[PDB]
């Protein structure tokens, strides 16, 4: 039970998973088969850092902006709560 990082390889139209965290950035769910699942993403992992910058209570648009700026791959630091 600790914090880790995941490297997602953005394809062409994004990745496939879903993001929803007005305040507490969290991966609502992932689509098995996308570059996100290829690393080992599992819905529930709370997003702490996005693009090397923390986002405990950041803005949804700002967080998305960072992910849509990867230009090939994004570095997200999430923590597994259950399991």
UniProtKB/Swiss-Prot annotation:
Domain of life: Eukaryota
Tissues expressed in: Isoform 3 is brain specific.
Protein location: Nucleus; Cytoplasm; Cell projection, Dendrite; Synapse
Domain PDZ positions: 5-81
Domain comment in the entry: The GoLoco domain is necessary for interaction with GNAI1, GNAI2 and GNAI3.
Function: Regulates G protein-coupled receptor signaling cascades. Inhibits signal transduction by increasing the GTPase activity of G protein alpha subunits, thereby driving them into their inactive GDP-bound form.
Summary of subunit composition and partner proteins: Interacts with GNAI1. Interacts with GNAI2 and GNAI3; the interactions are GDP-dependent.
Protein name: Regulator of G-protein signaling 12
Species: Homo sapiens (Human)
Source lineage: Eukaryota, Metazoa, Chordata, Craniata, Vertebrata
Gene: RGS12
Boundaries of the shown chain within the full protein: 18 to 100 of 1447
């Amino acid at each position: 039970p600790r914090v880790r990082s995941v490297e997602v390889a953005r394809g062409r139209a994004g990745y496939g998973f879903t993001l929803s965290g007005q305040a507490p950035c969290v991966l609502s769910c992932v689509m098995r088969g996308s570059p996100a699942d290829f690393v080992g993403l599992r819905a529930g992992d709370q997003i702490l850092a996005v693009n090397e910058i923390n986002v405990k209570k950041a803005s949804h648009e700002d967080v998305v902006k960072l992910i849509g700026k990867c230009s090939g791959v994004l570095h997200m630091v999430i923590a597994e709560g259950v399991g």
